[PDB]
PDB file of all heavy atoms in Angstrom:
ATOM      1  N   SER B  59      66.269 330.058 157.034  1.00  0.00           N
ATOM      2  CA  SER B  59      67.201 329.224 157.789  1.00  0.00           C
ATOM      3  C   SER B  59      67.030 327.754 157.424  1.00  0.00           C
ATOM      4  O   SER B  59      66.021 327.367 156.836  1.00  0.00           O
ATOM      5  CB  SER B  59      66.985 329.402 159.293  1.00  0.00           C
ATOM      6  OG  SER B  59      65.784 328.777 159.709  1.00  0.00           O
ATOM      7  N   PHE B  60      68.014 326.939 157.789  1.00  0.00           N
ATOM      8  CA  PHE B  60      67.983 325.511 157.487  1.00  0.00           C
ATOM      9  C   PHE B  60      66.891 324.776 158.257  1.00  0.00           C
ATOM     10  O   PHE B  60      66.587 323.623 157.961  1.00  0.00           O
ATOM     11  CB  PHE B  60      69.346 324.883 157.795  1.00  0.00           C
ATOM     12  CG  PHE B  60      69.604 324.675 159.262  1.00  0.00           C
ATOM     13  CD1 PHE B  60      69.135 323.537 159.910  1.00  0.00           C
ATOM     14  CD2 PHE B  60      70.303 325.623 159.997  1.00  0.00           C
ATOM     15  CE1 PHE B  60      69.358 323.346 161.270  1.00  0.00           C
ATOM     16  CE2 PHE B  60      70.532 325.439 161.360  1.00  0.00           C
ATOM     17  CZ  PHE B  60      70.058 324.299 161.995  1.00  0.00           C
ATOM     18  N   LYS B  61      66.308 325.449 159.245  1.00  0.00           N
ATOM     19  CA  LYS B  61      65.252 324.858 160.062  1.00  0.00           C
ATOM     20  C   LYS B  61      64.149 324.228 159.209  1.00  0.00           C
ATOM     21  O   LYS B  61      63.543 323.231 159.601  1.00  0.00           O
ATOM     22  CB  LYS B  61      64.635 325.924 160.976  1.00  0.00           C
ATOM     23  CG  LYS B  61      65.567 326.487 162.046  1.00  0.00           C
ATOM     24  CD  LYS B  61      65.922 325.442 163.094  1.00  0.00           C
ATOM     25  CE  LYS B  61      66.565 326.078 164.325  1.00  0.00           C
ATOM     26  NZ  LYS B  61      67.752 326.827 163.913  1.00  0.00           N
ATOM     27  N   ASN B  87      64.298 331.687 164.569  1.00  0.00           N
ATOM     28  CA  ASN B  87      64.134 330.813 163.412  1.00  0.00           C
ATOM     29  C   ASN B  87      63.223 329.596 163.564  1.00  0.00           C
ATOM     30  O   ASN B  87      62.472 329.269 162.643  1.00  0.00           O
ATOM     31  CB  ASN B  87      65.513 330.372 162.916  1.00  0.00           C
ATOM     32  CG  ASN B  87      66.422 331.551 162.623  1.00  0.00           C
ATOM     33  OD1 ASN B  87      65.983 332.557 162.072  1.00  0.00           O
ATOM     34  ND2 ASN B  87      67.691 331.433 162.984  1.00  0.00           N
ATOM     35  N   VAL B 186      77.105 325.575 165.934  1.00  0.00           N
ATOM     36  CA  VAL B 186      76.603 324.605 166.896  1.00  0.00           C
ATOM     37  C   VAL B 186      75.861 325.287 168.040  1.00  0.00           C
ATOM     38  O   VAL B 186      76.463 325.978 168.864  1.00  0.00           O
ATOM     39  CB  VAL B 186      77.746 323.752 167.486  1.00  0.00           C
ATOM     40  CG1 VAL B 186      77.192 322.802 168.538  1.00  0.00           C
ATOM     41  CG2 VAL B 186      78.438 322.968 166.378  1.00  0.00           C
ATOM     42  N   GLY B 187      74.547 325.094 168.071  1.00  0.00           N
ATOM     43  CA  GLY B 187      73.721 325.663 169.119  1.00  0.00           C
ATOM     44  C   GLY B 187      73.235 324.513 169.977  1.00  0.00           C
ATOM     45  O   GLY B 187      73.881 324.154 170.961  1.00  0.00           O
ATOM     46  N   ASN B 188      72.099 323.930 169.602  1.00  0.00           N
ATOM     47  CA  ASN B 188      71.554 322.791 170.330  1.00  0.00           C
ATOM     48  C   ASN B 188      72.208 321.512 169.816  1.00  0.00           C
ATOM     49  O   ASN B 188      71.926 320.419 170.303  1.00  0.00           O
ATOM     50  CB  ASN B 188      70.036 322.712 170.156  1.00  0.00           C
ATOM     51  CG  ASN B 188      69.290 323.548 171.177  1.00  0.00           C
ATOM     52  OD1 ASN B 188      69.402 323.318 172.384  1.00  0.00           O
ATOM     53  ND2 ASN B 188      68.525 324.524 170.702  1.00  0.00           N
ATOM     54  N   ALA B 189      73.080 321.671 168.824  1.00  0.00           N
ATOM     55  CA  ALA B 189      73.823 320.562 168.226  1.00  0.00           C
ATOM     56  C   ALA B 189      72.973 319.585 167.421  1.00  0.00           C
ATOM     57  O   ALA B 189      73.435 318.500 167.066  1.00  0.00           O
ATOM     58  CB  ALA B 189      74.591 319.808 169.310  1.00  0.00           C
ATOM     59  N   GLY B 190      71.737 319.967 167.127  1.00  0.00           N
ATOM     60  CA  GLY B 190      70.875 319.089 166.360  1.00  0.00           C
ATOM     61  C   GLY B 190      71.263 319.043 164.893  1.00  0.00           C
ATOM     62  O   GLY B 190      71.073 318.030 164.222  1.00  0.00           O
ATOM     63  N   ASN B 191      71.820 320.142 164.396  1.00  0.00           N
ATOM     64  CA  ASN B 191      72.218 320.231 162.997  1.00  0.00           C
ATOM     65  C   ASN B 191      73.498 319.447 162.710  1.00  0.00           C
ATOM     66  O   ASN B 191      73.559 318.689 161.738  1.00  0.00           O
ATOM     67  CB  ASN B 191      72.387 321.702 162.600  1.00  0.00           C
ATOM     68  CG  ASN B 191      72.354 321.910 161.098  1.00  0.00           C
ATOM     69  OD1 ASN B 191      71.628 321.220 160.381  1.00  0.00           O
ATOM     70  ND2 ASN B 191      73.124 322.880 160.616  1.00  0.00           N
ATOM     71  N   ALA B 240      71.467 332.928 167.428  1.00  0.00           N
ATOM     72  CA  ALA B 240      71.108 331.583 166.989  1.00  0.00           C
ATOM     73  C   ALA B 240      71.842 330.462 167.727  1.00  0.00           C
ATOM     74  O   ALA B 240      71.299 329.372 167.896  1.00  0.00           O
ATOM     75  CB  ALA B 240      71.333 331.456 165.490  1.00  0.00           C
ATOM     76  N   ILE B 241      73.071 330.721 168.159  1.00  0.00           N
ATOM     77  CA  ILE B 241      73.838 329.706 168.876  1.00  0.00           C
ATOM     78  C   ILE B 241      74.122 330.092 170.326  1.00  0.00           C
ATOM     79  O   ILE B 241      75.081 329.610 170.926  1.00  0.00           O
ATOM     80  CB  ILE B 241      75.180 329.406 168.171  1.00  0.00           C
ATOM     81  CG1 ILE B 241      75.971 330.700 167.977  1.00  0.00           C
ATOM     82  CG2 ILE B 241      74.925 328.722 166.839  1.00  0.00           C
ATOM     83  CD1 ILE B 241      77.322 330.494 167.323  1.00  0.00           C
ATOM     84  N   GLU B 287      73.651 335.516 158.690  1.00  0.00           N
ATOM     85  CA  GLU B 287      73.581 336.069 160.035  1.00  0.00           C
ATOM     86  C   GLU B 287      74.790 335.618 160.856  1.00  0.00           C
ATOM     87  O   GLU B 287      75.412 334.596 160.553  1.00  0.00           O
ATOM     88  CB  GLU B 287      72.265 335.680 160.729  1.00  0.00           C
ATOM     89  CG  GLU B 287      71.945 334.200 160.797  1.00  0.00           C
ATOM     90  CD  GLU B 287      70.639 333.940 161.538  1.00  0.00           C
ATOM     91  OE1 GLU B 287      70.583 334.186 162.762  1.00  0.00           O
ATOM     92  OE2 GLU B 287      69.663 333.499 160.895  1.00  0.00           O
ATOM     93  N   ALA B 289      75.556 333.960 163.647  1.00  0.00           N
ATOM     94  CA  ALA B 289      75.710 332.551 163.990  1.00  0.00           C
ATOM     95  C   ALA B 289      76.263 331.740 162.820  1.00  0.00           C
ATOM     96  O   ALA B 289      77.144 330.895 162.999  1.00  0.00           O
ATOM     97  CB  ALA B 289      74.377 331.974 164.435  1.00  0.00           C
ATOM     98  N   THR B 317      73.937 328.519 157.942  1.00  0.00           N
ATOM     99  CA  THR B 317      72.608 328.297 158.500  1.00  0.00           C
ATOM    100  C   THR B 317      71.489 329.309 158.253  1.00  0.00           C
ATOM    101  O   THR B 317      70.354 328.911 157.994  1.00  0.00           O
ATOM    102  CB  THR B 317      72.722 328.059 160.014  1.00  0.00           C
ATOM    103  OG1 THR B 317      73.464 329.129 160.612  1.00  0.00           O
ATOM    104  CG2 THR B 317      73.437 326.743 160.291  1.00  0.00           C
ATOM    105  N   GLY B 318      71.787 330.601 158.336  1.00  0.00           N
ATOM    106  CA  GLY B 318      70.747 331.598 158.126  1.00  0.00           C
ATOM    107  C   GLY B 318      71.148 332.794 157.284  1.00  0.00           C
ATOM    108  O   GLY B 318      72.330 333.099 157.137  1.00  0.00           O
TER     109      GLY B 318
HETATM  110  C1  LIG C 402      68.884 326.868 164.679  1.00  0.00           C
HETATM  111  C2  LIG C 402      70.107 327.644 164.128  1.00  0.00           C
HETATM  112  C3  LIG C 402      71.437 327.353 164.496  1.00  0.00           C
HETATM  113  C4  LIG C 402      71.830 326.246 165.482  1.00  0.00           C
HETATM  114  O1  LIG C 402      71.662 324.909 165.002  1.00  0.00           O
HETATM  115  P1  LIG C 402      71.531 323.681 166.019  1.00  0.00           P
HETATM  116  O2  LIG C 402      71.000 322.545 165.249  1.00  0.00           O
HETATM  117  O3  LIG C 402      70.822 324.118 167.242  1.00  0.00           O
HETATM  118  O4  LIG C 402      73.063 323.390 166.384  1.00  0.00           O
HETATM  119  C5  LIG C 402      72.462 328.083 163.963  1.00  0.00           C
HETATM  120  N1  LIG C 402      72.219 329.091 163.082  1.00  0.00           N
HETATM  121  C6  LIG C 402      70.943 329.393 162.710  1.00  0.00           C
HETATM  122  C7  LIG C 402      70.736 330.535 161.726  1.00  0.00           C
HETATM  123  C8  LIG C 402      69.879 328.676 163.225  1.00  0.00           C
HETATM  124  O5  LIG C 402      68.580 328.983 162.839  1.00  0.00           O
END
Side-chain angles (χ1 to χ4, degrees):
Chain B
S59 73
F60 76 84
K61 294 292 194 303
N87 305 319
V186 177
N188 273 299
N191 199 35
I241 55 179
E287 55 178 293
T317 53

